[PDB]
Amino acid sequence: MIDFRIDKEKAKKWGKKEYSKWKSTLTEEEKRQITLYTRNASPINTYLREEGIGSKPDMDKKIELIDKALIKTKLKDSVTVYRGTDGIIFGKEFQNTLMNGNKVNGEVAKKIKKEFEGTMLLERGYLSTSLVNGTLFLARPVLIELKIPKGGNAGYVDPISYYPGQLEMLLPRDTKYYIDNIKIIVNGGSQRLKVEARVLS
Known part of the structure; x- marks a missing residue:
């Protein structure tokens, strides 16, 4: 298992x-649609989460291209992303x-833990992640x-x-x-809920 943590150069x-x-x-058209997704991902992902395929043909065309691009690669190693x-x-x-405020509500965290630990989640949009735990996530x-x-299947699009x-x-x-663990973390200046999960492939 590869986990780069915050080491951006590696x-x-x-x-x-x-x-x-x-x-x-x-x-070339696949590359262009990937770029356009990274430029503004919310329309595509909202469409997939809320409307689903079939509603807008021009959106479906973009989604067909990205879908077709992502099955063209396969990870050589297992890897952690953030x-x-x-x-x-x-x-x-x-x-x-x-x-x-800057603290996680402890009662809500406990309820989320009890309700979602040991369950599978399903993301209807594309799932954008990073090889590093970047400062933007703080x-x-x-x-x-x-x-x-x-x-x-996961593609390095940087x-x-x-x-x-x-x-x-x-x-x-x-x-x-699949969610293996949920806990409150307190590093930096604001507490967060940390979710440790595995892609099922």
């Missing part, structure tokens, strides 16, 4: 080796209930540490991302991940 070298092999399989988010992963009702209330198994430096690993839509 992570970048590893990811570029994965991208170098992927890029010779990608079409994603900052908020309570939405637990349902819209938990969003905006997690925090009381300001988010939930930190997901996700293990991706060797042979899994060399064509609109935001180079995010060290993004992009996972397919409808990814299933």
